[PDB]
Symmetry: T
Subunit: 149 residues, 12 copies
């Protein structure tokens, strides 16, 4: 698919619903609809749209990767916690043959807890953006656009 | 919140619906409904009520820690197997700024298989109780009373 | 339960719905539907039937394992990526006192990524077939047949 | 050897003589005398007495463990720093057939330094209580009260 | 070579000569003769023959593997102790290009002593079957049937 | 300092001078001159200039991080190999208090040799981009331009 | 020193005062008094005399090795739990140049918990005996005789 | 089998043929002939005999262990290098339900190279003597005599 | 407290009482008495006094750190073996708030046995000095002077 | 070469040029220039002179080590970052048979990130001082005097 | 023994009988007869002869080292798989005091699976050549000649 | 390019400038200039010339390697200490497609400090020569001549 012909799937994993409500010194005060708004503007700036979701359930994120592989031109995914534990999500993205994928972490995970240092997604994520705050979704977006067409 | 306003959320993770039915030597012969009754008792004796729940679904448990965040005076969680795996629930509890959390295990995990040794949830549980059998959630309830009112 | 009296539960974990559609030199070219078919066949030859399911959700799998515990003669399981991350699954099958359980892998995970080398389910599962193709489902059904009898 | 006819032995390792002069944001405001008072109030709460002790010597705590074996009905122990070092104390508690043993940590040791996550005594203690404040000690006694008859 | 014109080589490694004088709780009551016999049946069932041997000698196993690389249609092997130690058999198997090879463990090694969890032979063995009791050989003969037929 | 008053220093480590001369599968066909010229255009588009440099010398990258410290509004750095070996550069970057720093990798380093998975610079770099190709440099300037504004 | 002139020192670490009263399937039914008597006899047997003592205190143990170093002809030592924790007794022992030392473990430690398989004592001790029953103390006596006379 | 009824099997592993010709600092200057002689002595003194062998071949030691299992009253073994590498030989010994095994090492393996620190044989041997020189064999024979009666 | 009014506590770990008496090629020929003389001179030069102690006993040192806590201007400790072993002495010293602590090793521990590389006391001591012989103490005194005045 | 005949090489590693320009809690507020002044002073107090240097470049420090090998009486070195990275600087100091080397870090590196805990240089430095601030330079000079002069 | 009066023993480990037959992108197109041929040619050139052997058996190889021990001027070995598993060949090679030992691998093992990275033999081999093709065998002869001549 | 068209680049890393001056038993009595003279001879002997260099500097060896990529027929390189620390250099050689690289260590690093055991360069070097003295340079040149001409 192209951006002209289909949306970017944007995917958000657990706890991100409450984004903007706390520890803004690590995550900022933008809320999750604030992020979504960025991504609409971001894709619009390039022709495309986005389809922005959030779930706290690993199987659903997996089900939405299944959909995107089929119906969308690329994925910007913040796996959030499942970044560090989900092989099922990684595997979901391994079936996405030549659908581009960007991982995105609002905080720089390399400077926080050692569990945080490692991510399964980065194994498939074509690129990975970290510590760019919610602007990094915007990079995820520009990247998807550059690649998809 | 106080004990007098809002109920202590009590959350139970995978397999625990089945508590009562096998391995007496490790887990006891009380069932989950009995556990729930022992908590009703304990909270009461301190002016409190409880919203006692179980689920096998990591994300639902996230959802519910989301709920208690707004609506309860504290959380008693037996994460069950999700203690050793779930960066998700760990993260959920961390959105619970201010609120007391007591993790409970029925078995002495420290005496068991290596992977049972670490709980992500103890990164955030205010208190941890292990191998005190089901009397352990009583301690939870007691300690939520202590910190709450 | 024995063979003639109840079904063998056959469980598939995440992404396997999708099997056949790529990387076949790792997975084969059989759909999940051909796998179910092979299974109906194998149970049949030994006078049994199968209760054959897939799910991308871990809790849904534990749920199904509770069911099997009650209603079925054994389990053949490909946990797909929870093999690796799911103490929840392990624990659920642990609750299955004298239920014959076989763990099945289409690929030989011991030749793959270091992180796939290890399975939680192998700690309970009675037998484990790896790298024997979709046919290991068939050995999976054969072994239950020998045990459930 | 019920709770009715023998004291609970209550042991405190190195440094705890000075409890309350520092880090009350970690260890509280209560002195050990105070703690000891809780212990008395908590044992009589359940129709028992306590024999409460503190020592900076590893071998004297070993000696007091052997004393409780013949003389006492249970042990409540916060082994302090020896928790992370003392196989002596572990081994002495091991000679303690039948006798109940709750291990106590006022602080959540799993939230502090990596060398504080592991406790030798945990490999024997029946209950391990942590992060529960000096109230962690009432729990210990409540747990002996329950097991000791 | 093919199933129709060459025996299946079946190699057994150290101590299997005594299989079934002791620890039936792990190995069953069937002798090595009984197992060869089962392999005689399962090979016929599929249009085949077997060349079943056993040696306590790591070098003779290599010797024999080299042989099968020309004389036999494939290899089922239970390396017994040399599984966890023999890079030399590993490497003998690696010279058997396009030859089918199933590794067989009667016990489930993943449920045993930790140094039994890793196999060298697994790195090359196309299929690995663990903890299926001697029936593991039949399965091993069946996959050779399938792949060599 | 802003892009307004000040050039964004963009620092490149060893072997970068050869960029676009072999292995285009990994690093591409764009060159070091080319890449700079993206940088120019990307700093232009956000009201700014670049100070774009390469070096094989760890000590001179250090010397250069000190320059910028006093004279530039930000650092975008692809440390190349020094990202994995260089405590000097990180300590350089840490002398850069209240200066924005963005680390770039052409490749996804998390998809490569295990020794490439860790970066020292990532303990200071506010943000980190990886496996977005030289676009990633553009992201780096976009982030610098943002933070300095 | 010789057996003629000077006793062999027999040192017993913590808990070994209780030897006899429990866990006989590991440590047996002989008592510390029984062992002393066993050792007097093995010394009498080979020309010598013993100075046989037992302590729960690491520093006393240490003190006594200093004494052995001036006044005695050998050290045979069961350090008990100290074998695994005590750098102090290791170095107490290293102060004893060309004094004979045999380390004694009633139990065979390479068969117990993993913390038990390492002894600091073994680093210096001339000989180490393990798993030979209280009889291994008679081997130390024997060994010291061989060495001192 | 008692001592009055069968020889004690003495097994010597690789390299020991040349015992005596070098590192008299670590091994002494008594040759194998000489060790063998010390054992004829030891056994006689205790009412018995020795069947004394040496092999550089791992499988040959297993053969002989299979043998002693049935024709002998017990094993004293110096596996030499194969203490560290041979799981096979470990399992040869496992098979000997109720036979007394004692492992001997002439040097103290806990003072040499880390790769010598660990022995697979120790996991079965009832006793281990290390660091007692050629006299350890003699302890091995006394231990068996003790046990074979 | 300052040099003027309170002695510098100088604590010496186990074994040091025998300082001088051997391996002067690692620790020198000065005796502990010589070192105390050094300390009395270094403090004198500074308008100070010292309180020079030595114990083999982990716990005694705990009591003396508690005594220095209220009665001295700083501490110069050589914990000797206890550096590497003793969390209590660490915890003890952490109780001395805003008291200058200097840790002193005579040998350079970073060149010895890998167990002697790590000191717990180094987590607290404001400063650590190794491999400067007995002169290290004198540096230890000078540092306290600098910091008690 | 002696204090009388030759200066002390005092060597400073990366980033130490900027000493006193930031985080004085951690490194103090003297400049490198101030430090120099102290060392001229400290060596004068003791009949000596100094050659005080700083460089960012691993290899030039190596050049300067080689130079001091032939020209100076000893080396006081603070290798900054290359303490932790630089085998070459260690190998260099290694070339200085018989020359006094003292390693100095201002901050107590053992109290920081794990990566600052190990120093290659500690492997050859005769003395190592850390956590004494800039005074520790003074001790290094004092140490060289005693060793040289 | 020099090259004039004695042949160099060239010892070849498991599987190398099959060199030529497969994987020439990894091991080369030449056979062992071909290698032997080189070795003859290279010894000839330095006035020496070679005694060239291959075994798949570990104790055989050990036998031939003991033989080379008294009858040859040096050893060249490609222990192939036993480089990574055989402490017994290492120890065999240790018995050869004064004998020049060169170890050779045709493949560059430090590029291979991570278990291929470590060779017991390299702990005793005076030189090790790896990944210089069958040519590495000639350097071996060359080196032995340097050292026996 | 061939041995006929261009010199062999011979790179010498840190500290090698001082060869001969110390550690003859480790490195020999040859000087750097002596080494070079062997290398010249070594190449003429094969109808080749050398370009022989040394530097203490990481980045300049990098620079030299880049020059060789253009101008030389191959690299012999003894990275010295940068062997264990330099991904810069590895990556410098990674740039050198189709250029024969031989790595040389005078000593056998696999016999030395555990950190010497690993070299990054070996990951790319076609061959590694070790412990062959400065004869390994001659072997390195040989190899290059084989590969290059
Ligand atoms: O930084 C991230 O984007 C990250 O991926 C996101 C995470 C995270 C952690 C806790 C909470 C939340 S959501 C949130 C953020 C701010 C306020 C409230 C909720 C996200 C973690 O799971 C990851 O480890 C890091
Ligand atoms: O939390 C505990 O109860 C703990 O067991 C007790 C400890 C401890 C550590 C230092 C001092 C003290 S005692 C104290 C506490 C607060 C103020 C004064 C003294 C206890 C640590 O040894 C353990 O790691 C944790
Ligand atoms: O399960 C297996 O087949 C296995 O390969 C078999 C093994 C084994 C272990 C001990 C003895 C024997 S043979 C035997 C079996 C039963 C009774 C007596 C001997 C095999 C182990 O060596 C392996 O770890 C696992
Ligand atoms: O991906 C990167 O940006 C990276 O920093 C760049 C690296 C790298 C590796 C080889 C060569 C070069 S520079 C180059 C690129 C293409 C052709 C020639 C040289 C960089 C590695 O040092 C790092 O792992 C990864
Ligand atoms: O086996 C030994 O002699 C050993 O020294 C003894 C130990 C030990 C452990 C617990 C208790 C005792 S003593 C004892 C034995 C039986 C009953 C009562 C006390 C010894 C362990 O600490 C060591 O791991 C090994
Ligand atoms: O100490 C032992 O008895 C030991 O079993 C014996 C060994 C050993 C090593 C090399 C040679 C020999 S035999 C020998 C002794 C002296 C000179 C020549 C050969 C034994 C090692 O393999 C073991 O780790 C330790
Ligand atoms: O180097 C030290 O000063 C140290 O603190 C002191 C130690 C030590 C070790 C053995 C003996 C002694 S004291 C001694 C010295 C010579 C003869 C007798 C006793 C100290 C080690 O425990 C520590 O690793 C390091
Ligand atoms: O503690 C030290 O002296 C150390 O040697 C010095 C270091 C260090 C770290 C950052 C900056 C500086 S220099 C500096 C000091 C103040 C302001 C600016 C730069 C030194 C680290 O490289 C080392 O890990 C530790
Ligand atoms: O590279 C080597 O020389 C090596 O020593 C040789 C080995 C090896 C492994 C399997 C087969 C062969 S020989 C061979 C070559 C081509 C076809 C068939 C067999 C060598 C491995 O055992 C070692 O890890 C590496
Ligand atoms: O052995 C080598 O060839 C080596 O390449 C060279 C090294 C080395 C180390 C210190 C000094 C020198 S050069 C030297 C050698 C002897 C006397 C003087 C200088 C080389 C080591 O760094 C490496 O670990 C190995």
């Amino acid at each position: 698919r192209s951006l002209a012909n289909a949306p970017i799937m944007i995917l958000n994993g657990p706890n991100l619903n409450l984004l903007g409500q706390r520890q803004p010194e690590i995550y900022g005060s933008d809320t999750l609809a604030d992020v979504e708004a960025l991504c609409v503007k971001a894709a619009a700036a390039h022709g495309g749209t986005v389809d922005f979701r959030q779930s706290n359930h690993e199987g659903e994120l997996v089900d939405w990767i299944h959909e995107a592989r089929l119906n969308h031109c690329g994925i910007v995914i913040n796996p959030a916690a499942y970044s560090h534990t989900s092989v099922a999500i990684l595997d979901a993205l391994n079936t996405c043959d030549g659908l581009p994928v960007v991982e995105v972490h609002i905080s720089n995970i390399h400077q926080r807890e050692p569990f945080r240092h490692h991510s399964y997604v980065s194994q498939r994520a074509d690129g990975v953006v970290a510590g760019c705050g919610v602007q990094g979704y915007v990079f995820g977006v520009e990247r998807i656009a550059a690649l998809a067409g």
